[PDB]
Write an enzyme that holds these catalytic residues in place. Structure first.
Site, mmCIF file in Angstrom:
data_model
loop_
_atom_site.group_PDB
_atom_site.id
_atom_site.type_symbol
_atom_site.label_atom_id
_atom_site.label_comp_id
_atom_site.label_asym_id
_atom_site.label_seq_id
_atom_site.Cartn_x
_atom_site.Cartn_y
_atom_site.Cartn_z
ATOM 1 C CD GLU A 16 1.435 3.708 8.296
ATOM 2 O OE1 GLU A 16 2.709 3.424 8.352
ATOM 3 O OE2 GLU A 16 0.715 2.261 8.334
ATOM 4 C CE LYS A 28 -2.272 -1.575 3.654
ATOM 5 N NZ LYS A 28 -1.393 -0.177 4.052
ATOM 6 N NE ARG A 32 6.047 -3.806 1.904
ATOM 7 C CZ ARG A 32 5.830 -3.123 0.710
ATOM 8 N NH1 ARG A 32 5.222 -2.124 0.750
ATOM 9 N NH2 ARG A 32 6.288 -3.799 -0.189
ATOM 10 N NE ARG A 57 -3.729 0.676 7.372
ATOM 11 C CZ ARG A 57 -3.990 -0.658 6.763
ATOM 12 N NH1 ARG A 57 -5.039 -0.888 6.193
ATOM 13 N NH2 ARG A 57 -2.952 -1.574 6.600
ATOM 14 N NE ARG A 65 2.870 0.720 8.740
ATOM 15 C CZ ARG A 65 2.819 -0.005 7.723
ATOM 16 N NH1 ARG A 65 2.704 -1.392 7.759
ATOM 17 N NH2 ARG A 65 2.343 0.806 6.633
HETATM 18 C C1 LIG Z 1 -5.115 0.466 11.009
HETATM 19 C C2 LIG Z 1 -4.648 -0.598 12.192
HETATM 20 C C3 LIG Z 1 -3.581 -1.162 12.151
HETATM 21 C C4 LIG Z 1 -2.406 -1.013 10.812
HETATM 22 C C5 LIG Z 1 -0.938 -0.679 11.256
HETATM 23 C C6 LIG Z 1 0.054 -1.680 11.394
HETATM 24 O O1 LIG Z 1 -0.670 -2.936 12.183
HETATM 25 C C7 LIG Z 1 -0.501 0.369 10.483
HETATM 26 O O2 LIG Z 1 -0.668 0.157 8.759
HETATM 27 N N1 LIG Z 1 -3.140 -1.951 13.206
HETATM 28 C C8 LIG Z 1 -3.912 -2.038 14.483
HETATM 29 O O3 LIG Z 1 -3.377 -2.689 15.166
HETATM 30 N N2 LIG Z 1 -5.000 -1.166 14.556
HETATM 31 C C9 LIG Z 1 -5.306 -0.379 13.345
HETATM 32 O O4 LIG Z 1 -6.392 0.216 13.472
#
Ligand SMILES: Cc1c(CC(CO)CO)[nH]c(=O)[nH]c1=O
Ligand SMILES: Cc1c(CC(CO)CO)[nH]c(=O)[nH]c1=O
Lengths: 310, 305
Positions: B33, B17, B166, B109, B168
């Site tokens: 993001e 994404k 990738r 998102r 986070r």
């Molecule tokens: C959007 C979202 C995520 C995605 C994170 C990576 O887990 C960032 O893309 N992760 C969560 O745990 N809750 C959420 O609402």
């Protein structure tokens, strides 16, 4: 189309809201008025186990230093989701049936035991003052408040603190009573401020250191905006991060079209009832969107009353 | 009045994404993001807290009830940026334009990822109660016209492979979570189709316990959960009403499937070719584009690092 009158009884707990409401429902015909009660059963069983007890336990735990602020916040944030569920879902299914405003009889009258903002704004804000919730989470609940539907008549209540403390006493957290009383005072002042043209962005700099539909424009310091000056929300330059600033804009848009009225709860149950009755006269009504909206709305309220009120 | 195109690039994380959108001055803005909000502004390292809590629940260090509290709380923080952006953007959205646009707004998102999809996935991981999920669902903002949502397709092994390189900040490579999140998004896509083809969850409810997807292949199966049913097996009305909101919110969304199994150049064109069928809308004020730009650039600047 037939018209509708929605009335949300809100304010700090322990003033006689419930009794007053039921006395008002008892006056009208069987089906020309319906009461959407406090969803206690959802809070004690359906949504989770004893949600109110957990909240008061957590605060007490925090007060004694048995848990940290972080732990407290996580519990309160999670418990307010649960506390507001029933109001939120009710607002979402009711919404489509609500049309434009008619003017200050109604084919149907809906009396609610509180409004969504109680669980998405007031209690959270009050918990922030108690140190059991972060200002960021409060603004998160604020951004989730549903679009304010036309004809949103909200009745807040005034009751002297000494009488309040008395009436409330049958735990007894006086710090919380003070905080919920302050939050609701701020709230009514916020509605008058916003209805008088007040612009938080323009008056923000007046920060440092109740009447809802009457009086002069209140100072931003007497509105809910001042709670949100916490260091957590301030960028290195002293100004609000835009995320929180935008949450304050949502808070303005949601309260500005609301119709708030103050009910003097420092009187007898029947006194309150009549008092509330007189107040309904100047409350804005709306048209329903379909012909079958009235009946549908009754079912929704009765069903809600039966499943969640006791 | 000018036209606007809103494109929400969602789906399970780790497919590409971010790369896709990146590759892409005034006729298109990319709202990224909000990592900084999750790591600093809203709370301290929110992705870390999420993954740590799952892990500790997995190891038996904490209880299901403990995880849920943290997990529900963490989801309030994660979705805040999305929810606040929707609330201040909503007013400016007019009706649908029809079948170029003055402004193309690409989002990383949509509010439903934090209010529905991640929470449902945590429910499937045992770290969140179904009641908390439905409460988030009750708060899903109304679906405005032109809500085009791009969802990704990618074989699981490729996904694991791509997700692994990738990660986070504070994230843990959890394969049970990957499956959960992949199941939910597939059900999400099936749900929109079901609803658009006339499906009525109340009419088909009986099929869970005995030209559209079967109800068992939609998000409605998750809510058969025993916590939501009364002693006689009926769904409590509170929950039924929450499912009615889900149906209403999802149904009007326009879903587009982006194949991620290809190079980043393929995925960039792919997305761009997908816009021919996306629904545009009119803005409500003449100065709505300019305002929308500020919002978007400011968001990016402050929350996208
Ligand atoms: C959007 C979202 C995520 C995605 C994170 C990576 O887990 C960032 O893309 N992760 C969560 O745990 N809750 C959420 O609402
Ligand atoms: C609405 C609400 C209340 C009101 C209760 C008393 O706590 C009943 O009036 N109390 C809370 O603690 N949180 C809430 O959201």
């Amino acid at each position: 189309m037939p018209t509708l009158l929605r009335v949300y009884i809100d304010g700090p707990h322990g003033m006689g809201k419930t009794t007053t409401t039921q006395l008002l429902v008892a006056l009208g015909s069987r089906d020309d008025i319906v009461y959407v009660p406090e969803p206690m059963t959802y809070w004690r069983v359906l949504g989770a186990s004893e949600t109110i007890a957990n909240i008061y336990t957590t605060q007490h735990r925090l007060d004694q230093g048995e848990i940290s602020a972080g732990d407290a916040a996580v519990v309160m944030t999670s418990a307010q989701i649960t506390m507001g569920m029933p109001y939120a879902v009710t607002d979402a299914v009711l919404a489509p049936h609500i049309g434009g405003e008619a003017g200050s009889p109604p084919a149907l009258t809906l009396i609610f035991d509180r409004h969504p903002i109680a669980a998405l704004l007031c209690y959270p804000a009050a918990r922030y003052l108690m140190g059991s919730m972060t200002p960021q989470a409060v603004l998160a609940f604020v951004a989730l408040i549903p679009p304010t539907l036309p004809g949103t008549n909200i009745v807040l209540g005034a009751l002297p603190e000494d009488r309040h403390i008395d009436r409330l006493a049958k735990r007894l957290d006086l710090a919380m009573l003070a905080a919920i009383r302050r939050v609701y005072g701020l709230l009514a002042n916020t509605v008058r401020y916003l209805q008088c043209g007040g612009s938080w962005r323009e008056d923000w700099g007046q920060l440092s250191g109740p009447q809802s539909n009457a009086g002069p424009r209140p100072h931003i310091g007497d509105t809910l905006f001042t709670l949100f000056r916490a260091p957590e929300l301030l960028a290195p330059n002293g100004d609000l991060y835009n995320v929180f600033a935008w949450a304050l804009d949502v808070l303005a848009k949601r309260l500005r079209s609301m119709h708030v009225f103050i009910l003097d709860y420092d009187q007898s149950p029947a006194g309150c009832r009549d008092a509330l009755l007189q107040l309904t006269s100047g409350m804005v009504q709306t048209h329903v969107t379909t012909p079958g909206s009235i009946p549908t709305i009754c079912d929704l309220a009765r069903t809600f009353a039966r499943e969640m009120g006791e």
